[PDB]
């Protein structure tokens, strides 16, 4: 717009929450599909669904992590990461079934004198590799689901050797996308790159993806949010620089079925 409007400057508003950004590289809509409610033609569960709307379909800001020369990368799972977030987590646990889209806004600012590139990826059914070489598909429910704090990637695969009392957890190696495939190709998946010299953040609008119209949000995680350093953090001359990466996410057009007593998971 000769009037002023621009790709880099956006304003997102959901329920009682609003996000502003003066340095964005546009925004991405996974597979060109904007989140939507379950249609009658595609519906399964016959009971009147619970649609929290503004109470849950708003912006939740998770615990801010620190990016450094040493960082190999971070990972999160949806809905798992939002499981303890206000009215959204409450409605998710009270219902047998649930479906939801997301507006993922990854925030990470610095300075015209800093360097680095964060590869922000949205992966459908992001199944990760375990820490065991004597057994398989053994990663425990508690460890597979870190909740809000999420997990992290490792530059090296080090097998759990304690056969007696197994760590029973994931060993996601960075260059292999934590799942047996080459990172260089992760780009076939809905994503955006946070290149310090070009932009403050990454905005990904994710639709409800799955082999089913609606499923068990507590048993199954539809989307995986992977953040890896394509180009290592670097500043002026400081040998050990640091910058925060804040992750804010908002559930969308989300709905729930099969209402009963609240589900109290064994998360530890």
Partner 1 sequence: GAQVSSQKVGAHENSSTINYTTINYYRDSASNAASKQDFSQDPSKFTEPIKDVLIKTAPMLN
Partner 2 sequence: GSSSTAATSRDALPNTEASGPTHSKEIPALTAVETGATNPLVPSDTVQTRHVVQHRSRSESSIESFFARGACVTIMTVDNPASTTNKDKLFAVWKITYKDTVQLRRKLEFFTYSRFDMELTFVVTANFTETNNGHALNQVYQIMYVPPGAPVPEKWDDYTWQTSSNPSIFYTYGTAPARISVPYVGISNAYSHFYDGFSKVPLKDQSAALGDSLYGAASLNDFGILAVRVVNDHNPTKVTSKIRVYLKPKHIRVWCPRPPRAVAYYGPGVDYKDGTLTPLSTKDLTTY
Partner 3 sequence: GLPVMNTPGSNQYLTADNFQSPCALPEFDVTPPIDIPGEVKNMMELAEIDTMIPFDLSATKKNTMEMYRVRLSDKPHTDDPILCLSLSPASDPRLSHTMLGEILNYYTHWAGSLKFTFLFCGSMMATGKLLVSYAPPGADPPKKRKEAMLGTHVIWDIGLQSSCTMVVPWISNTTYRQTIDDSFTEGGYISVFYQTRIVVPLSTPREMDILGFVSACNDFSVRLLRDTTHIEQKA
243 binds, among partner 1, partner 2, partner 3, none (CB under 5 to 8 A by kind): none
The kind and range of the H/E element at 116 are: strand 114-124
Report 239-268 residues binding partner 2 (CB under 8 A).
263-267
Report 3-22 residues binding partner 1 (CB under 8 A).
6-8
The kind and range of the H/E element at 141 are: helix 141-144
Smallest separation (angstroms) from partner 2 to the CB of 127: 5
User: How far apart, in whole angstroms, are the C-alpha atoms of residue 18 and residue 103?
Assistant: 12
Report 93-152 residues binding partner 2 (CB under 8 A).
124-130, 132-133, 136-142, 144
Q: Which of 68, 80, 92, 106 is nearest to 191 (CA)?
A: 106
Residue 193 interacts with partner 1 (CB under 8 A)?
A: no
User: How far apart, in whole angstroms, are the C-alpha atoms of residue 205 and residue 250?
Assistant: 9
Give whichever of 161 and 216 is closer to partner 3, judged by the CB atom: 216
Report 50-89 residues binding partner 3 (CB under 8 A).
72
232 binds, among partner 2, partner 3, partner 1, none (CB under 5 to 8 A by kind): partner 3
Smallest separation (angstroms) from partner 1 to the CB of 9: 10
**Beta-sheet pairing, 242-259 with 151-152:** unpaired
User: How far apart, in whole angstroms, are the C-alpha atoms of residue 123 and residue 76?
Assistant: 10
């Amino acid at each position: 717009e000769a009037c002023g409007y621009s790709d880099r400057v956006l304003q997102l508003t959901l329920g009682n929450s609003t996000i502003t950004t003066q340095e964005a590289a546009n925004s991405v809509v996974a597979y060109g599909r904007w989140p939507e409610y379950l249609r009658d033609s595609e519906a399964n569960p016959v009971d009147q669904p619970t649609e929290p709307d503004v109470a849950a379909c708003r912006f939740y800001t998770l615990d801010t992590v620190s990016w450094t020369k040493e960082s190999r990368g971070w990972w999160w799972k949806l809905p798992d990461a939002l499981r303890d977030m206000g009215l959204f987590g409450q409605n998710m646990y009270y219902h047998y079934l649930g479906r939801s889209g997301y507006t993922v806004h990854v925030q990470c600012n610095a300075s015209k004198f800093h360097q680095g590139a964060l590869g922000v990826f949205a992966v459908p059914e992001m199944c990760l590799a375990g820490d065991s070489n004597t057994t398989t598909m053994h990663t425990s429910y508690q460890n597979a689901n870190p909740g809000e704090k999420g997990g992290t990637f490792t530059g090296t695969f080090t097998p759990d050797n304690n056969q007696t009392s197994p760590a029973r957890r994931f060993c996601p190696v960075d260059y292999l996308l934590g799942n047996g495939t080459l990172l260089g190709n992760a780009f076939v998946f809905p994503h955006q790159i946070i290149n310090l010299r070009t932009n403050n953040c990454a905005t990904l609008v994710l639709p409800y993806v799955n082999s089913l119209s609606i499923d068990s949000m507590v048993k199954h995680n539809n989307w995986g949010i992977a953040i890896l350093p394509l180009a290592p953090l670097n500043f002026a001359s400081e040998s050990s620089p640091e910058i925060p990466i804040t992750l804010t996410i908002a559930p969308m057009c989300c709905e729930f079925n099969g209402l009963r007593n609240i589900t109290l998971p064994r998360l530890q």
